[PDB]
Amino acid sequence: RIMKAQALRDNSTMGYMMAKKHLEINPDHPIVETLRQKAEADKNDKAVKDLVVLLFETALL
Amino acid sequence: RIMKAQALRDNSTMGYMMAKKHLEINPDHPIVETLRQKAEADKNDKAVKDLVVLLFETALL
Amino acid sequence: NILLFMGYMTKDNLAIVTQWCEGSSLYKHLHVQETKFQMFQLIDIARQTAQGMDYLHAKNIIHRDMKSNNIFLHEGLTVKIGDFGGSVLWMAPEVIRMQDNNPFSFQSDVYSYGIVLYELMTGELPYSHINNRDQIIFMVGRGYASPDLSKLYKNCPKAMKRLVADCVKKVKEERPLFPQILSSIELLQ
Amino acid sequence: VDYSVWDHIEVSDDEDETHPNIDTASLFRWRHQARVERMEQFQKEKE
Amino acid sequence: YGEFYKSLTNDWEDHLAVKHFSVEGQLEFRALLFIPRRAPFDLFENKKKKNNIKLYVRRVF
Amino acid sequence: WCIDLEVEEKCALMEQVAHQTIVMQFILELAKSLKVDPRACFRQFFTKIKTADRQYMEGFNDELEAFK
Amino acid sequence: IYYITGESKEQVANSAFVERVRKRGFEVVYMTEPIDEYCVQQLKEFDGKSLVSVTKEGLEL
Predict the structure, then answer these.
(1) Which stretches of A1-45 are DSSP H helices?
(2) Which of A8, A42, D30 is nearest to B2 (CA)?
(3) For residue C68, what is the domain's CATH number?
(4) Rounded Cα distance, C93 and C103, in Å
(5) Would you give the end-to-end CA distance of chain A in angstroms?
């Protein structure tokens, strides 16, 4: 956040330096429990694909 | 966003330079048309109160 | 073989090009919005602009029509003279007349300071209820008019309200008092 | 070694002589104006 | 000290704290170091560090 | 050159290959990792006291000597 | 001159303030750097034409 807000960014170098994300899931949670039961009933379900992104975005925020 | 993120600026005196938020609604768009129908039956209905915070949050974001 | 130990621990920057507050005109601050500060701050911005005018006049530098707008009020206790600024003019009658084409003498700006000091004290235009354009032009140009003391605030103590009343009396006068005005207001704080 | 030719120089747009109670950027344009008007009255005196 | 700080600094307020000391040896200096009560408006905005410690020799600046 | 006489070579001259290659190869990895020229990015960074020079240098000295 | 400022070109190009001016065939300038705020504070006009923010109240089209 702070580096992106600087006036004199030197933006190319920071565009390399920004470090990557790891997602963590709570095994006990009704959402993860449900999403797993849904994904086990059909691995290729378009509803679980649409879910995983909606869920993911919320965790960015 | 940028002034909040400065390392060495005292933002306590922002009061005279912070702007105030004016909310604008699309009169044509279905959700706002439906919201005048929802608000029509009960001006005090919490269910329409709950939208006007959720929509505000979604619009802020 | 060559792969590991990637992390490179580079330098970070703390140099800031600090934003400057767009200052309010006193019109913005007083009428056009009515933003409120305690009267000691109002006397402080009078002192601050009187120092600016004093430092200015020492260099034979004259701008005609010194006003409450061409001054800017910024973040902190911070008030500072600018040039951006029918239209709302304030004038000594010598400037109004056709008579002398360079009415350049410092006394005009001192009396125009006296007008903006009465704006600081009234928070509303001088002559705001009294006149339309014909009367406010003619009677002032003829030397035959004064703005009312009714709008001048009684939360001011005797020291500064009397000094401001002398800033009305200076219309009758030729005195370039600025360093001594500055002394007077400073000491009366 | 006389340097008296250099004694007095006028510079508008000088940051070393800005008064703290005046908008600095206003003072430069305003100090430049005085220089040019002084020169034009002296050119008129030559006419 | 309290009225000396106001004289040196043009402040209204009394000093927050003082150090006063003398260094012996070949370098014989004496120094006052005052902390202001409230940080000056332009503490970081200035082009260069604005005159905070003044150096004297035999009481001439 | 550290490959040239691996069967027989004397420790000092190969320990100087360790030094040259670790410093230059780190730079070349940064030059792939950034836009920079290896003359423009520069050995001002070699002042650093950090454990990443000391521990990792000897770890790779052993790896690169032993394998060939 | 119509302009908008924000965190990237595509985030600005998709932003909800921009649809009417696109539909009406106007040209929007994209200002995607933190330093743009500080020059736009001072560049109030160009060639006698004022600069108007697409993200402020009272926007006239």
Answers:
(1) 2-5, 11-17, 30-41
(2) A8
(3) 1.10.510.10
(4) 10
(5) 12
CA C70 to chain CA centroid, nearest Å: 7
Q: d(Cα G48, Cα F65) in Å, to the nearest integer? A: 72
The CA R_g of chain C, rounded to the nearest whole Å, is 22
CB–CB contacts below 8 A, A to F: 5
Alpha helices in chain G (DSSP H): 9-14, 19-23, 34-40
Amino acid at A11: N
The chain B residue lying nearest C18, using CA atoms, is B9
Total number of domains in chain C: 1
- Residue in chain C lying closest to A13 (CA): C10
In a domain, C5, yes or no: no
Say how many Å lie between the first and final Cα of chain F, rounded: 12
Whether the CB-CB separation of C182 and C50 falls below 8 Å is answered with yes
* Residue in F65, B50, A20, D3 with CA at minimum distance from that of residue C6: A20
Query: Is C33 inside any structural domain?
Result: yes
What domain range includes position C112?
Answer: 26-188
In the structure encoding, which two tokens stand for residue F22, read together? Answer: 């670790």
Please tell me the distance from the alpha carbon of residue G21 to that of residue G1, in angstroms, as a whole number.
12
The label of the residue with tokens 């001006």 reads B43
- Quote the crossing angle between the two packed helices C107-122 and C39-57, to the nearest 10°: 170
Q: Tell me, yes or no, whether C10 lies in a domain.
A: no
| C18 neighbors B9 (Cβ within 8 angstroms) | yes
In this structure, how many other beta carbons lie within 10 angstroms of the beta carbon of residue B28? 7
Q: Cβ contact (<8 Å) for C8 and F33?
A: yes
Residues of A in contact with C15 (CB under 8 A): 8
Beta carbons of D21 and C178 less than 8 angstroms apart: no
Residue C17 lies in a domain: no
Per DSSP, G11 falls in state H
